[PDB]
Enzyme design. Structure first.
Site, PDB file in Angstrom:
ATOM      1  N   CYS A   1       0.548  -1.626   0.226  1.00  0.00           N
ATOM      2  CA  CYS A   1      -0.288  -0.201  -0.393  1.00  0.00           C
ATOM      3  C   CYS A   1       0.999   1.224   0.549  1.00  0.00           C
ATOM      4  CB  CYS A   1      -0.807   0.257   1.424  1.00  0.00           C
ATOM      5  SG  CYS A   1      -2.195   1.392   1.938  1.00  0.00           S
TER       6      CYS A   1
ATOM      7  N   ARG B   1      -6.567 -10.936  13.035  1.00  0.00           N
ATOM      8  CA  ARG B   1      -5.999 -10.474  11.697  1.00  0.00           C
ATOM      9  C   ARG B   1      -7.378 -10.325  10.928  1.00  0.00           C
ATOM     10  NH1 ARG B   1      -1.010 -10.945   8.141  1.00  0.00           N
ATOM     11  NH2 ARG B   1       0.078 -11.299  10.187  1.00  0.00           N
TER      12      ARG B   1
ATOM     13  N   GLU C   1      -4.817  -8.759  -2.278  1.00  0.00           N
ATOM     14  CA  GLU C   1      -5.257  -8.897  -0.426  1.00  0.00           C
ATOM     15  C   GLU C   1      -4.560  -7.699   0.186  1.00  0.00           C
ATOM     16  OE1 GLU C   1      -3.133  -9.658   1.307  1.00  0.00           O
ATOM     17  OE2 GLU C   1      -4.230 -10.248   3.100  1.00  0.00           O
TER      18      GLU C   1
ATOM     19  N   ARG D   1      -7.912  -7.995   7.050  1.00  0.00           N
ATOM     20  CA  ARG D   1      -7.476  -7.661   5.688  1.00  0.00           C
ATOM     21  C   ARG D   1      -8.461  -7.618   4.812  1.00  0.00           C
ATOM     22  NH1 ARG D   1      -1.453  -8.012   6.759  1.00  0.00           N
ATOM     23  NH2 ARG D   1      -1.490  -7.864   3.982  1.00  0.00           N
TER      24      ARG D   1
END
Ligand SMILES: C[S@@+](CC[C@H](N)C(=O)[O-])C[C@H]1O[C@@H](n2cnc3c(N)ncnc32)[C@H](O)[C@@H]1O
Length: 327
Positions: free
Chosen positions: A81, A163, A119, A165
Site C-alpha cells: 500500500c 487478522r 489483498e 485484511r
C-alpha cells in the site's frame, strides 16, 4: 490449510505477482489451477520460494514489459500500500502513476484475464479519507471490470489469530457475473495451545524478566479472543504477554519490543516468543512448507504474508461462479 475435494479450478492458468512466500500459490494450486508466472525481488523470499516450488521468481516488476507476460485467466496480487497524490480532475488510472499499483493496471489493460484477485491491510478502506480505495476501484471499473471488496477476519475461518485484511475480487464485465459471494464465517475449535511444539524444541526462546507484572491469572476456558495476562517494561507494544488458551495477536513484520514480532506467551510457567513453525501454523501453512534457515527472516516473511485458509474458501467460490453458465 484444508483440503478441497472439488477442484473447481482445474485447467485454469494464473500469475503470482509480488509472490513473497507463495501463499496465493499454495491456495490456488489446491483448487486445481496451474502456475504460469511469479515475480518477487527480495532475495530471501526467492530463496524460500525456490526451496518449495522448485523455481525462482523473476525480478523487479517495474522493469518487466507487459506484452511479455504469459496468457492467463487469473491475476493474483498482494501489493504494498502507498498513497496516491491526486492532482487533477476527479480520480482514476492516471493517478496510479508512481506507485506499484500502476504496475498491476499496466498488466491488466494489455493481457487477458478473467479475474484480478488482490489483498491488502485492514485499513485500505479508510486511507486518505477513502481516496486510496476510490482510485483502485475507479481504475478497475474503467478497464471494464466489476469491483467487490470486504474485510474478513481469520478467526472466523478456522485460524486462531486476530487478522483483518481487505480482500478484493474483480470479474471482467465480459463474463456477466452477478453470482459471486464471500464465504460465511464459522465456529472456531482450534486455539494457540494446539499449535505449539514440545518444550524440548523451544528452550532457546524463553525470556526471563524481573520486571514482569501479572495483571490476570490463567483462565481455565478457551475463548476466540485475545487475553492479556501480563506485562514487562512500560507495557507497550512487544512487551505484553498473552494466554495460550486464546487467539494469537496479529503477527507483524516490522515491530519492536522485548517479544518483537510474535508477541510473548505464557507457556508452562515460562515466558517465550513463537517459533517459526508455530508462526507458519498460525498463518495456515502446512507442516511440509520448508522455512528459511534464518529465524529472523521467517518472522519478517510470515508477517507480511497471507492466511492460506481464507484464500482457499474465496478461490473455491470463484471456480463456482465461473462454472455456472446455463442455457
Ligand atoms: C519494482 S520495485 C518498486 C519501484 C517503485 N516504483 C518505486 O517508485 O520505488 C518492486 C517493489 O515490489 C515490492 N514488493 C515485492 N513483493 C511484494 C509483496 N508480496 N507485497 C507488497 N510489496 C511487494 C518490493 O519491496 C519493491 O518495493
Amino acid at each position: 490449510m484444508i483440503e478441497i475435494k472439488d477442484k473447481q479450478l482445474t485447467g485454469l492458468r494464473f500469475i503470482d505477482l509480488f509472490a513473497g512466500l507463495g501463499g496465493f500459490r499454495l491456495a490456488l494450486e489446491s483448487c486445481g489451477a496451474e502456475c504460469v508466472y511469479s515475480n518477487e525481488w527480495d532475495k530471501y523470499a526467492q530463496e524460500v520460494y525456490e526451496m518449495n516450488f522448485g523455481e525462482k521468481p523473476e525480478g523487479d516488476i517495474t522493469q518487466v514489459n507487459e506484452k511479455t507476460i504469459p496468457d492467463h485467466d487469473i491475476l493474483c496480487a498482494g501489493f504494498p500500500c502507498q498513497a496516491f497524490s491526486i492532482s487533477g480532475k476527479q480520480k482514476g488510472f492516471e493517478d496510479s502513476r508512481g506507485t506499484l499499483f500502476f504496475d498491476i493496471a499496466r498488466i491488466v489493460r494489455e493481457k487477458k484475464p478473467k479475474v484480478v484477485f488482490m489483498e491488502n491491510v485492514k485499513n485500505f478502506a479508510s486511507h486518505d479519507n477513502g481516496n486510496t480505495l476510490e482510485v483502485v476501484k475507479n481504475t478497475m471499473n474503467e478497464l471494464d471490470y466489476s469491483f467487490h471488496a470486504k474485510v474478513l477476519n481469520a478467526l472466523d475461518y478456522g485460524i486462531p489469530q486476530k487478522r483483518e485484511r481487505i480482500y478484493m475480487i474483480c470479474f471482467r464485465n465480459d463474463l456477466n457475473i452477478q453470482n459471486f459471494q464471500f464465504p460465511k464465517p464459522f465456529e472456531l475449535n482450534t486455539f494457540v495451545k494446539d499449535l505449539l511444539l514440545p518444550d524440548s524444541e523451544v528452550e532457546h526462546l524463553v525470556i526471563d524478566r524481573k520486571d514482569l507484572v501479572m495483571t490476570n491469572q490463567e483462565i481455565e476456558q478457551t475463548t476466540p479472543k485475545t487475553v492479556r495476562l501480563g506485562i514487562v517494561g512500560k507495557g507497550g507494544q512487544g512487551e505484553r504477554i498473552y494466554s495460550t488458551r486464546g487467539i494469537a495477536i496479529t503477527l507483524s513484520a516490522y515491530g519492536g519490543g522485548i517479544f518483537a514480532k510474535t508477541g510473548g506467551y505464557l507457556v508452562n510457567g515460562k515466558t517465550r516468543k513463537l517459533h517459526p513453525r508455530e508462526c507458519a501454523r498460525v498463518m495456515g501453512y502446512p507442516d511440509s512448507y520448508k522455512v528459511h534457515p534464518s529465524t529472523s527472516q521467517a518472522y519478517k516473511q510470515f508477517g507480511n504474508s497471507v492466511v492460506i485458509n481464507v484464500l482457499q474458501y474465496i478461490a473455491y467460490n470463484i471456480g463456482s461462479s465461473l462454472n455456472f453458465k446455463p442455457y
